[PDB]
Write a protein that binds this ligand. Sequence first.
Ligand code: HEM
Length: 385
Amino acid sequence: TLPRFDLMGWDKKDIADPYPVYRRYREAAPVHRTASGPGKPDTYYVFTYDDVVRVLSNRRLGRNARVARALRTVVENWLVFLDPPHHTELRSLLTTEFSPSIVTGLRPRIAELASALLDRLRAQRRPDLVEGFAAPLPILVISALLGIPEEDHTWLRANAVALQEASTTRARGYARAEAASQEFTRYFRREVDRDLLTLLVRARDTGSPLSVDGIVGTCVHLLTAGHETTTNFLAKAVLTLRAHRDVLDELRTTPESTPAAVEELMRYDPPVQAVTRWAYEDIRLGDHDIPRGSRVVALLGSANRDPARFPDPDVLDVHRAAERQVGFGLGIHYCLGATLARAEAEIGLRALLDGIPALGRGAHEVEYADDMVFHGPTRLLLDLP
Ligand code: HEM
């Protein structure tokens, strides 16, 4: 027997290494039911690659529970929380502002920022890679995309961190989050009244239906999006490579391999460990007949280590075929900043490899956040030289 599954209330040691946990449940059964009341609604956890793909592509499974606070206003038009209707119009909106075209031209600036961060990082005995590089890099890149002042990166990040307090994937948390939400709102509303902001504002100045609240809420999502994902990718990437010195060393000596490495590092330990859905109709999955209204949880980290799809899943193999891992999702809700995130991943990782020769040497001090959805270290100390 195994205890009832749930992503909340995980032992700190399992948070550090969840994969063996996924494996035992996955070997037991592809889908696991974790009952409610009665009063319900019941939840179903999907551990298999194929079933996760089924979950993510089924139109009958939507994002919000559809019955069988400057924070509330900031979070209310975040694209990651909208279903197809509201969702379709908004996604189409900012989609091409994150095109390979814009990202490609942004890469040189991303590298410049990564380099600058390292320069400072190099000036301390035992640096924190999270607070000193992984966390500030996404903030700084998106800030340059929004035309925000570079020097605000530290303040903005502090608030992004505060905002996380109220996350449903975590545990007076709302106080800090509301404080932050109000701080962001006041901040961005002042910005609207004077470059992605320009375009979003300009859209309203020339007839495009956009509320100042919508532009503001949008800015807060984009500003905090990479901080809760890319940051975690980079920090865990350092942990993975230190644990796999053969790959770390090959990467140092084969720069052109960075892209494939990032794809495999993403498969191996993805930043977002799960995405939730709600059944709008009865569904069958695994051996389960899932009633309309049940909550369905797609375990991306579990899917990415599914031996049925990835042979020897625990081996870090940069030679696997690309475009299979589901770390950026799959379907209509496929990560919007996937292109931008991938560029920050490759550029930031290369910066670290070329910037910290002893990255793979010595011991490290790591502490993970009590979060099994946005998964990663809250701090990663490194013994340098
Ligand atoms: C490497 C880091 C990242 C990972 C692993 C990641 C992963 C994901 C996943 C799995 C989803 C699917 C959610 C669902 O099924 O409902 C998603 C959605 C989304 N992501 Fe990311 N993401 C990353 C970075 C970013 C960044 C940097 C931005 C901002 C520019 C961003 C913006 C979004 C948006 C707007 C959605 C919702 C899109 C929709 O519903 O159509 N992501 N992401």
